[PDB]
Design a protein around this ligand. Structure first.
Ligand SMILES: [Mg+2]
Ligand SMILES: [Mg+2]
Ligand SMILES: [Mg+2]
Ligand SMILES: [Mg+2]
Ligand SMILES: [Mg+2]
Ligand SMILES: [Mg+2]
Ligand SMILES: [Mg+2]
Ligand SMILES: [Mg+2]
Ligand SMILES: [Mg+2]
Ligand SMILES: [Mg+2]
Ligand SMILES: [Mg+2]
Ligand SMILES: [Mg+2]
Ligand SMILES: [Mg+2]
Ligand SMILES: [Mg+2]
Ligand SMILES: [Mg+2]
Ligand SMILES: [Mg+2]
Ligand SMILES: [Mg+2]
Ligand SMILES: [Mg+2]
Ligand SMILES: [Mg+2]
Ligand SMILES: [Mg+2]
Ligand SMILES: [Mg+2]
Ligand SMILES: [Mg+2]
Ligand SMILES: [Mg+2]
Ligand SMILES: [Mg+2]
Ligand SMILES: [Mg+2]
Ligand SMILES: [Mg+2]
Ligand SMILES: [Mg+2]
Ligand SMILES: [Mg+2]
Ligand SMILES: [Mg+2]
Ligand SMILES: [Mg+2]
Ligand SMILES: [Mg+2]
Ligand SMILES: [Mg+2]
Ligand SMILES: [Mg+2]
Ligand SMILES: [Mg+2]
Ligand SMILES: [Mg+2]
Ligand SMILES: [Mg+2]
Ligand SMILES: [Mg+2]
Ligand SMILES: [Mg+2]
Ligand SMILES: [Mg+2]
Ligand SMILES: [Mg+2]
Ligand SMILES: [Mg+2]
Ligand SMILES: [Mg+2]
Ligand SMILES: [Mg+2]
Ligand SMILES: [Mg+2]
Ligand SMILES: [Mg+2]
Ligand SMILES: [Mg+2]
Ligand SMILES: [Mg+2]
Ligand SMILES: [Mg+2]
Ligand SMILES: [Mg+2]
Ligand SMILES: [Mg+2]
Ligand SMILES: [Mg+2]
Ligand SMILES: [Mg+2]
Ligand SMILES: [Mg+2]
Ligand SMILES: [Mg+2]
Ligand SMILES: [Mg+2]
Ligand SMILES: [Mg+2]
Ligand SMILES: [Mg+2]
Lengths: 90, 56
RNA sequence: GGAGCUGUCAACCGAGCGUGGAUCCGAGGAUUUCCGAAUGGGGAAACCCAGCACGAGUGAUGUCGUGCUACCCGCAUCUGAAUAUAUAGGGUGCGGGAGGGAACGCGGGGAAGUGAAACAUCUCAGUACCCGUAGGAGGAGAAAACAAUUGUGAUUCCGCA
RNA sequence: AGGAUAUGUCUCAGCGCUACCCGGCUGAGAGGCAGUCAGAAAGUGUCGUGGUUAGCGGAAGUGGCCUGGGAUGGUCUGCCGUAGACGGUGAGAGCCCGGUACGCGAAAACCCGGCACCUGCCUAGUAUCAAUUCCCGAGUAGCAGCGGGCCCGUGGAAUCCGCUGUGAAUCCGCCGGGACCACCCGGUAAGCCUAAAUACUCCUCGAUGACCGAUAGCGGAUUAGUACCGUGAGGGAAUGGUGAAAAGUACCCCGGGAGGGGAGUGAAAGAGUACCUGAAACCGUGUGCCUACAAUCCGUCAGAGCCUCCUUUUCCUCUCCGGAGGAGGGUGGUGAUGGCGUGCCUUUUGAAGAAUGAGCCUGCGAGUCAGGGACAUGUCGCAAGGUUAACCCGUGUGGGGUA
RNA sequence: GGGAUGAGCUGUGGGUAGGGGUGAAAGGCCAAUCAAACUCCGUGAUAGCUGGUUCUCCCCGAAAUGCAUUUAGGUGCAGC
RNA sequence: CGCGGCACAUCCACCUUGUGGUGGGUGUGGGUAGGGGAGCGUCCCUCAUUCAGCGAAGCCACCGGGUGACCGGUGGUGGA
């Protein structure tokens, strides 16, 4: 996916609309991610997070506002890279 | 078949729904924005039949 | 191709791998037990017992690994029984075949129910089925043809008639 | 074919006995042409804006307010579009995601095409005359017997094919023109090869559906040719749905457990792994009326009395009350009692019939389709004319097409 | 109750297959089926015979006779 | 026979004076086989329009409606 484990994201839909966290783990097969401090869950002993759909998060461009992900043709050395739109650099 | 088509076109023309244009986009490249602006200039109704040559 | 992964029912774990490019996708190659046309011989398919040659192992028998060893047909060679010419046959060395596959093709064999308000000619129907044999298609195909007083000009398939 | 008039792709060498004319043959070289083909067969290279087998990029809303668990809904606004195909995401998304329009992308293998290599073929016979001779596919044609098949069922039975017998001719020949004969016309059997237009789908990709939606659609959405049945060949099932997310109920109590109650999660547990919705038959529990002196196709008409809830009166006037009750009226439930009254279907002259079928509920289960078919009608177009079939061109349902 | 040293009984292995087998013979038996087994296919066999055939209203409304019939419980034509 | 509602056919007068309606007379309206005419309900598609998480479908109850098949309103349950 375009969202990676180390990234910081903005929740754009759901109960936690407007929360900022970093991805903890990604599930490409399920298209879900674990963002820290979102949609917490009251499990039973004897409040962790549950994954949300990757469609519901947008990658913060590390320069302010969230953005959609594009790819600039690097390589140039030696493979492709993942950049921003809306002031694209990453 | 031909009589029915002629009658339908006659009804359209009689109500004044036949329009004639030179071409849709003054350039040589497609542009839906300007084409839609031109069609909206011609018409404010939903269903429009555009008859243009097969080479355009 | 680019950050996660160790398939699924189907989770629980355990233990690990990954930007020095994993998991994943494509192509080519390697390995490929035993049965099966099954083909060393046998056999109640998936089991049993060999021969030859070359290596391994043992104090030596035992044991192990790898190749080859069915039958028929064609070609080339050596031999030529009863028997003389010779042939049948035999040895050797090269090639090939066998079996499977849903439909479609060509050649051959060929029902009955049923219809005839009974039934045998007739129909059903050259259908079902069976046998032989293909190919990507096949078959047919270049006038010992039609036509009829004019003429057309290999075959196939479609529409009329 | 063979004879008389006429001559050499170009050269060289050899041979055709010797000196010569005319040559002819073989080998080589020089040219021309063709080629993986029916017309001869393989292989080595090299090159494709060539193709197939992985893929990649790809525009535009974190917009306000309302409802909501959640916005993809409503209502205001902004934008892209060669992209408003389709699907997913917590509810109808062109702008959130995979993608779509469009455009790039191949180490290698395979396929196709080109250019070479390579392989092969072409080394004078053209024309005129002569019209004597030879040749033109043999156990064949023909004929007869018995059959097969043709519109043709043996018929006057041609043409074609098989077995048996008999058995020719080579152009002044032979065969066909529906018995057969004469004339005319057509053709040249008994040797081989041959693309395309045609048929099909186990299979692989890409789409589509006035197709099905779990008793349907494949037998098979579920272990499916499985379980199971049969010695065997064979036969052959049934079984999908929590929720957006497992957040799948910690802890306490009764209980051996199972199960439950309280808490807790969740928008909802009126979603608790026996889980979406949750009908009917069927089985309870509570409650209003009736029923233990009566003979009942079980209903229908008449009908008292109870019970329930609304309302017009005279009263508790406490009345702002609210209605206790009384009188009337009306809903709804029940039905003491009176009359009338022989189930439904099929099939029959005639059935309540002691003739047939049905235990009950739910689901499924029977005049359909094809064809320029036939007849007759309603309606529409054109009209002494009407109309095309195959087929051709078009993303289509459109335009041509006179047989 | 009959036979119980015999034309005996029985185990293991084998053979005969459907107009065929086998039968000290009953049309007996041939996988709980036999006056022609079973399975699949022809095949959705055929049946002048039995049964079934699903919503509504409005108008009209029969026949059970004649002739013929390999016909008589079917059909054709007439009659209605 | 009386009074009221419906339908078919026909006659008499108008509106397109039979495409069909309007008004009044008159006659008719049991029905199996069977013939003819007009309709209800279910599903899918197209065109237009209109509702729906402020709650669709389905199901249940009650109150109503039409000449019939049947229809509507309200509430409950439910979740597209
Ligand atoms: Mg691999
Ligand atoms: Mg491989
Ligand atoms: Mg063997
Ligand atoms: Mg053997
Ligand atoms: Mg000898
Ligand atoms: Mg073979
Ligand atoms: Mg017969
Ligand atoms: Mg018969
Ligand atoms: Mg019969
Ligand atoms: Mg082949
Ligand atoms: Mg061929
Ligand atoms: Mg992509
Ligand atoms: Mg709110
Ligand atoms: Mg959606
Ligand atoms: Mg969509
Ligand atoms: Mg989303
Ligand atoms: Mg014949
Ligand atoms: Mg004949
Ligand atoms: Mg002969
Ligand atoms: Mg003749
Ligand atoms: Mg000849
Ligand atoms: Mg041939
Ligand atoms: Mg061909
Ligand atoms: Mg099924
Ligand atoms: Mg269901
Ligand atoms: Mg078994
Ligand atoms: Mg709660
Ligand atoms: Mg609910
Ligand atoms: Mg629920
Ligand atoms: Mg249940
Ligand atoms: Mg339920
Ligand atoms: Mg009493
Ligand atoms: Mg009595
Ligand atoms: Mg009574
Ligand atoms: Mg009585
Ligand atoms: Mg009787
Ligand atoms: Mg009875
Ligand atoms: Mg009885
Ligand atoms: Mg009786
Ligand atoms: Mg009886
Ligand atoms: Mg009877
Ligand atoms: Mg019974
Ligand atoms: Mg039809
Ligand atoms: Mg007509
Ligand atoms: Mg045996
Ligand atoms: Mg007897
Ligand atoms: Mg038996
Ligand atoms: Mg038999
Ligand atoms: Mg028999
Ligand atoms: Mg048949
Ligand atoms: Mg009557
Ligand atoms: Mg009547
Ligand atoms: Mg009737
Ligand atoms: Mg809600
Ligand atoms: Mg529906
Ligand atoms: Mg309602
Ligand atoms: Mg409802």
């Amino acid at each position: 996916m375009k969202v990676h484990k180390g990234d910081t994201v903005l929740v754009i839909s759901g109960k936690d609309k407007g929360a900022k966290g970093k991805v903890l783990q990604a599930y490409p097969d399920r298209n879900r991610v674990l963002v820290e401090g979102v949609n917490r869950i009251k499990k039973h002993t004897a409040t962790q997070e549950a994954p949300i759909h990757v469609s519901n998060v947008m990658v913060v461009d590390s320069d302010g506002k969230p953005t959609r992900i594009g790819y600039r043709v690097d390589e140039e050395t030696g493979k492709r890279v993942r950049i921003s739109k809306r002031n694209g650099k990453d | 078949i031909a009589a029915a088509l002629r009658g339908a076109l006659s009804d359209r023309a009689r109500n004044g729904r036949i329009h004639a244009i030179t071409e849709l986009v003054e350039g040589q490249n497609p542009s839906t924005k300007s084409a839609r602006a031109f069609l909206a200039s011609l018409t404010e109704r939903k269903q429009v039949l555009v008859v243009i040559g097969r080479s355009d």
